[PDB]
């Protein structure tokens, strides 16, 4: 019933705002007019990106921004709401460039959330900006608060939420209330920073949009799919950093929740969220990439998958060798390591030497250039069928993607997502989800339904015995136990009645 969210980032750099034009793609490749009425109808949210936090610890435009041109761009976006009364134009604060641990504005994020007075000044500036520019809600993309900063981040979200709710009442906006989201970590290493307090982080949000992409890249030793739905036992595996989070759980509880090593997949991130009590499936949104990540220096044998590679990891890209054959946008952007889906379609179609291959465990496509030794991991309308089916089966809130300019000209990726959720004639009941590796962790938030004989006082239970008691099914950790389940450390809660 409830419509799935379809949240697309609209990113425009300052120089493009300051020189905004809808009639020159060499100046602005993706002007607002490319978001046609048909596309507008298929989105529920557009995340305008990025604003920042300044040294005055307020939400702010990049100070080089021409304000009149900014308002003009934003006005074109909010004009789209004429075609879709469900559509929201959010704005996003942060992004990797501004907010990463070494980013140019990082200290402003740390300081803005640090004290009650700072949080109030910061929260106020967010709602002020929202009202002043005509936005419909606030998205926070801080990558990422460290475990020490998490309490301040939580309080900042809570305070923003109160101010948004006030604003909704003031504007009589109950039909389309102002919203709050974050872009959340989609991989266990960064997720471990705030994982233990995930319920408090998600409580004030309408959605947490998981960045379930960038799970492979040149910083890793071995090529891999950047957004595998499920795991491939042939691919690399990773230490499960969540088992070291400050949860206060027992060895058995930790082990059951956090297998290690594990496959870094979209399903892993989603299940890791669902394991936590107080994190509802309907607030979890699955991020998908509208771009691929490209690697060079790869060996043959498995289509370039799971190979060592010679892809520079430095930022900015360290020379002028744009080796991703056929990638014209890569030349424009001086970086052969990222290619939009729009460009990847053209690369396949041209005489450039790529084969499109498919991994039926991960349910994702990849390109392999056998002659030069290149590998590209990306997503397409086919991988989106499996991801859409997972979103529905797991009762997730919807899909998020980065970014709108990377869809092809006809908006085929966006149209596919909309079709999979909303087309009366689309049927995926027989779509086979495959035998790729599922993340099997169980935690307090995702106990399965079970039945077992009622616990009987006086009975001596062997290790592994299952009983039902006071609403749950419990398993003895060793034998021989006679205590009431939940009264001491001998029983593990394994299911709910
Ligand atoms: C919604 N927020 C996100 O999606 N964030 C996110 N993906 N953060 C991590 C990715 C940062 C990315 N870095 C690289 O790609 C490293 N280069 N290499 N190899 C980045 O900062 N940019 C490229 C990018 C961004 C998002 C998704 C894929 C690639 C530069 C950038 C360009 C425009 C806006 C923001 C960042
Ligand atoms: C490859 C270009 C540099 O951009 N890198 C971003 C980055 C660096 C290290 N680890 C990461 C993990 C996830 C996403 C991005 C990165």
Phi first, then psi, for residue 96 (nearest 5°) are -60, -45
Please name which ligand lies nearest the alpha carbon of 182.
1
How close is the Cα of 167 to the center of ligand 1, in Å? 32
Q: How was this structure determined?
A: X-ray
**8 Å CB contact between 436 and 231:** yes
The CA distance from 366 to 375, in Å, is 7
Closest CA to 202 of 238, 153, 251, 240: 153
The SS3 assignment for 458 reads: coil
The CA distance from 229 to 360, in Å, is 10
Please name which ligand lies nearest the alpha carbon of 293.
1
The SS3 assignment for 473 reads: strand
The CA distance from 368 to 272, in Å, is 32
Query: Which own/partner contact pairs does 236-239 have at CB distance under 8 Å and 24+ positions apart?
Result: 236/264, 236/306, 237/261, 237/262, 237/263, 237/264, 238/188, 238/189, 238/262, 238/263, 238/264
393-425 burial code (b ≥16 CB/10 A, e <16): eeebbbbbbbbbbbbbeebebbbbbbbbbeeee
Known binding residue 478? Answer is no
Closest CA to 91 of 121, 134, 58: 134
CATH superfamily of 1-289+380-447: Glycosidases (3.20.20.80)
The CA distance from 377 to 367, in Å, is 7
- The maximal CA–CA distance of the chain, rounded, in angstroms, is 82
Residue length of the chain:
497
The number of the ligand 1 atom at minimal distance from the alpha carbon of 291 is 28
Helices (H), ranges, 50-133? 67-79, 96-99, 106-112, 116-133
381-393 and 412-422 helices cross at what angle (nearest 10)?
30
- The owner of tokens 């935690």 is 443
Residues 6+ apart with CB under 8 A from 169: none
For ligand 2, atom 10, which residue shows the shortest CA distance?
Answer: 219
For ligand 2, atom 11, which residue shows the shortest CA distance?
Answer: 219
CATH superfamily of 448-497: Carbohydrate-binding module superfamily 5/12 (2.10.10.20)
Reading the block at residue 374, the tokens are 């290149």
Please name which ligand lies nearest the alpha carbon of 96.
1
The CA distance from 109 to 92, in Å, is 14
Q: What is the resolution of this structure in A?
A: 2.0
The dihedral of CA 22, 26, 27, 29: what is its sign? positive
Segments making up each domain of the chain, as ranges: 1-289+380-447, 290-379, 448-497
Active site residue 382: no
35 DSSP 8-state letter: S
For ligand 1, atom 27, which residue shows the shortest CA distance?
Answer: 402
Using a 6 Å CB cutoff, which residues line ligand 2?
A: 214, 217-219, 313, 315
The CA distance from 218 to 294, in Å, is 8
For ligand 2, atom 14, which residue shows the shortest CA distance?
Answer: 214
Known binding residue 464? Answer is no
Using a 6 Å CB cutoff, which residues line ligand 1?
A: 9, 11, 95-97, 141, 143, 183, 211, 214, 217-218, 291, 315, 337-338, 402
CATH of domain 290-379: 3.10.50.10
The CA distance from 347 to 330, in Å, is 12
Residues 6+ apart with CB under 8 A from 385: 416, 420, 428, 431
């Amino acid at each position: 019933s409830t419509r799935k969210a379809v949240i697309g980032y609209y990113f425009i750099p300052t120089n493009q705002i300051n020189n905004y034009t809808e009639t020159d793609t060499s100046v602005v490749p993706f002007p607002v007019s490319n978001i046609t009425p048909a596309k507008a109808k298929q989105l529920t949210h557009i995340n305008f990106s990025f604003l920042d936090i300044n040294s005055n610890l307020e939400c702010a435009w990049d100070p080089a921004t021409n304000d009149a041109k900014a308002r003009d761009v934003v006005n074109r976006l909010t004009a789209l709401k004429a075609h879709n009364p469900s559509l929201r134009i959010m704005f996003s604060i942060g992004g990797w460039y501004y907010s990463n641990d070494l980013g140019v504005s990082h200290a402003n994020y740390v300081n803005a959330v640090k004290t009650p007075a700072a949080r109030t000044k910061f929260a106020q500036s967010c709602v002020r900006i929202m009202k002043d520019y005509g936005f419909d809600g606030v998205d926070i993309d801080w990558e990422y608060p460290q475990a020490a900063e998490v309490d301040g981040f939580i309080a900042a979200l809570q305070e923003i939420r109160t101010l948004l709710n006030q604003q909704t009442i003031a504007d009589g906006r109950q039909a389309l209330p102002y919203q709050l989201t974050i872009a959340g970590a989609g991989g266990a290493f960064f997720l471990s920073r705030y994982y233990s307090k995930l319920a408090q982080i998600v409580a004030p949000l309408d959605y947490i949009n998981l960045m379930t992409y960038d799970l492979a890249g040149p910083w890793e030793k071995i090529t891999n799919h950047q957004a595998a739905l499920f795991g491939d036992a042939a691919g690399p595996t990773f230490y499960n950093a969540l088992r070291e989070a400050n949860l206060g759980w027992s060895w058995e509880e930790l082990t059951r929740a956090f297998p290690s090593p594990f496959s870094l997949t979209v399903d892993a991130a989603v299940q890791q969220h669902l394991m936590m009590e107080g994190v509802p499936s309907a607030k979890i949104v699955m991020g998908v990439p509208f771009y691929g990540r490209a690697f060079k220096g790869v060996s043959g044998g498995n289509g370039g998958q799971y190979s060592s590679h010679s892809t520079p990891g430095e930022d900015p890209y360290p020379n002028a060798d744009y080796w991703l054959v056929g990638c014209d946008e890569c030349v424009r952007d001086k970086d052969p390591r990222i290619a939009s889906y729009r460009q990847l379609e053209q690369m396949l179609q041209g005489n450039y030497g790529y084969q499109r291959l498919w991994n039926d465990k991960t349910k994702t496509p990849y390109l392999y250039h056998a002659q030069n030794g290149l590998f590209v991991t990306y997503d397409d309308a086919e991988s989106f069928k499996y991801k859409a089916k997972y979103i529905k089966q797991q009762q997730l809130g919807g899909v998020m993607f980065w970014h709108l300019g990377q869809d092809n000209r006809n908006g085929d990726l966006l149209a596919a997502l909309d079709r999979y959720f909303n087309a009366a004639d689309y049927d995926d009941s027989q779509l086979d989800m495959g035998t790729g590796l599922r993340y099997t962790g169980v935690g307090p938030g995702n106990l399965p339904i079970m039945t077992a004989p009622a616990y009987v006082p006086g009975t001596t239970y062997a290790q592994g015995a299952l009983v039902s008691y006071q609403g749950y099914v419990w398993q003895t950790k060793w034998g021989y136990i006679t205590s009431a389940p939940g009264s001491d450390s001998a029983w593990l809660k394994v299911g709910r009645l």
